Design a protein around this motif. Structure first.
Motif, short mmCIF file in Angstrom:
data_model
loop_
_atom_site.label_atom_id
_atom_site.label_comp_id
_atom_site.label_asym_id
_atom_site.label_seq_id
_atom_site.Cartn_x
_atom_site.Cartn_y
_atom_site.Cartn_z
N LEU A 23 9.60 -5.99 -2.69
CA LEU A 23 8.92 -5.97 -1.39
C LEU A 23 7.79 -4.95 -1.28
O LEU A 23 8.04 -3.74 -1.32
CB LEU A 23 9.91 -5.62 -0.27
CG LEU A 23 10.99 -6.55 0.20
CD1 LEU A 23 11.74 -5.84 1.36
CD2 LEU A 23 10.34 -7.85 0.69
N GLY A 24 6.59 -5.41 -1.02
CA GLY A 24 5.53 -4.52 -0.61
C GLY A 24 4.79 -3.86 -1.75
O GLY A 24 3.66 -3.38 -1.57
N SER A 25 5.41 -3.79 -2.93
CA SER A 25 4.76 -3.11 -4.05
C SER A 25 5.42 -3.49 -5.37
O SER A 25 6.50 -4.12 -5.36
CB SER A 25 4.81 -1.58 -3.86
OG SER A 25 3.79 -0.97 -4.66
N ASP A 68 4.20 -7.49 4.67
CA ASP A 68 3.88 -6.54 5.75
C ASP A 68 4.81 -5.33 5.69
O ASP A 68 6.01 -5.50 5.82
CB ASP A 68 4.10 -7.30 7.07
CG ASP A 68 3.64 -6.53 8.33
OD1 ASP A 68 3.64 -7.17 9.41
OD2 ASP A 68 3.28 -5.32 8.28
N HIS A 69 4.27 -4.11 5.52
CA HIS A 69 5.11 -2.89 5.60
C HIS A 69 5.31 -2.45 7.05
O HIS A 69 4.31 -2.24 7.75
CB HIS A 69 4.51 -1.68 4.86
CG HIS A 69 3.71 -2.02 3.65
ND1 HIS A 69 4.21 -2.79 2.62
CD2 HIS A 69 2.46 -1.66 3.29
CE1 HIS A 69 3.29 -2.91 1.68
NE2 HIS A 69 2.22 -2.23 2.06
N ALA A 70 6.54 -2.35 7.56
CA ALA A 70 7.73 -3.08 7.10
C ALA A 70 8.24 -3.87 8.33
O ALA A 70 7.44 -4.23 9.23
CB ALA A 70 8.80 -2.10 6.57
N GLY A 195 -2.95 7.73 4.43
CA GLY A 195 -3.07 6.30 4.14
C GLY A 195 -4.44 5.70 4.38
O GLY A 195 -5.49 6.31 4.07
N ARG A 196 -4.40 4.51 4.96
CA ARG A 196 -5.57 3.75 5.36
C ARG A 196 -5.72 3.73 6.89
O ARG A 196 -4.74 3.45 7.57
CB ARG A 196 -5.42 2.32 4.87
CG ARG A 196 -5.28 2.11 3.39
CD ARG A 196 -4.64 0.73 3.08
NE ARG A 196 -4.49 0.62 1.63
CZ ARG A 196 -3.89 -0.37 1.00
NH1 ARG A 196 -3.37 -1.38 1.66
NH2 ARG A 196 -3.81 -0.36 -0.31
N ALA A 197 -6.92 4.00 7.43
CA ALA A 197 -7.15 3.92 8.86
C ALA A 197 -8.63 3.67 9.16
O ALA A 197 -9.47 3.87 8.30
CB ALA A 197 -6.64 5.22 9.57
NI NI Z 1 0.36 -2.22 0.96
#
Ligand code: NI
Ligand code: NI
Ligand code: NI
Length: 300
Positions: A23-25, A68-70, A195-197
């Motif tokens: 999941l996710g990675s 989608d996390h999570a 992270g990402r923003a």
């Molecule tokens: Ni991701």
């Protein structure tokens, strides 16, 4: 059993492992160890990876999961696939420990640098009972080689774009470690603390990146960025230095090639007396055991 450590602490894994969900990675980990047969579910994003595509012979046997996390598409479907192991990327710490309450083992990860990716592959190699040591040594060898080509070269001002054209990465983001190892001074560090923003477009224009990369899962094409009227004054747009990243999962065995790819686009002069294709070819041969026919579509 084996005792290994993850995000949450020490986990004991009962051996052998039969059914795994990713999941996710880490979607390419089963390609590198040839364990596609033990995988019963995986985030739908994985089906787009070209190494997954080339090594997974029966894709529809495997259930597609959220991605989608999570939190979305969770608990009952899990119990339906009856996995003895769930490998997951910790999006939400509490969303994951709540889940771990149900009878089956979770290996939980939140890798932030390629060295952490390598450690976490080794973790999963213990549970799957494979020797990863030669494959990890090739990964590290590739990073040593990049770093050597870029010694004393000035870092290029750049950035990566994700789900939209003002979403970028900063501190504590795997994408940001990968850009750094590719010789990019990522102005995202200066605006994103985790992270990402998003950030305002005005700031992107002010930072005026020399080069821009695009996350391989983004809906953006380079054309979408180059023709955005809001970006017309940016060096990277004027000079067409907008590149989409190859179809390689950042959290996994090809993360060093993504840095190589970025280093090549950003610092072409650093690699002019270098046989790129020999390096790419040996990478895929050692890491994934492809033969010569199988490597060719992976050559650059
Ligand atoms: Ni991701
Ligand atoms: Ni088919
Ligand atoms: Ni180690």
């Amino acid at each position: 059993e084996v005792k290994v450590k993850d995000y949450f602490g020490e986990q004991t894994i009962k051996l052998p492992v039969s059914k795994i969900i990713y999941l996710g990675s880490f979607a390419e980990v089963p390609a590198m160890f040839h364990t596609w047969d033990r995988v019963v579910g995986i985030s739908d994003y994985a089906f787009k990876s070209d190494i997954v595509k080339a090594t997974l012979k029966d894709p529809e046997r495997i259930k597609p999961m959220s991605s989608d996390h999570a939190a979305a598409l969770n608990v009952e479907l899990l119990k339906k696939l009856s996995p003895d192991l769930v490998v997951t990327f910790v999006g939400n710490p509490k969303a994951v420990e709540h889940a771990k309450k149900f009878g089956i083992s979770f290996l939980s990860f939140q890798e932030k640098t390629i060295a952490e990716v390598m450690e976490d592959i080794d973790t999963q190699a213990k549970a799957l009972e494979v020797d990863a040591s030669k494959k990890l040594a090739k990964m590290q060898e590739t990073l040593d080689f990049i770093a050597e080509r870029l010694k004393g070269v000035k870092k290029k001002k750049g950035v990566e774009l994700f789900h939209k054209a003002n979403k970028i990465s900063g501190h504590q983001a795997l994408d940001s470690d990968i850009l750094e190892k590719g010789g990019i001074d990522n102005f995202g560090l200066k605006y994103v603390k985790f992270g990402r923003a998003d950030i305002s477009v005005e700031k992107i224009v002010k930072e005026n990146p020399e080069i821009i990369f695009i996350w391989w899962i983004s809906p953006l094409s380079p054309e979408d960025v180059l023709n955005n009227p809001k970006f017309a004054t940016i060096k990277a747009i004027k000079n067409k230095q907008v590149y989409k990243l190859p179809t390689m999962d950042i959290g996994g065995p090809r993360a060093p090639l993504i840095s190589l790819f970025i280093a090549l686009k950003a610092h072409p002069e650093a690699f002019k007396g270098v046989d790129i294709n020999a390096i790419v070819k040996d990478y895929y041969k050692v890491v994934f055991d492809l033969n010569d026919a199988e490597v060719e579509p992976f050559l650059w």
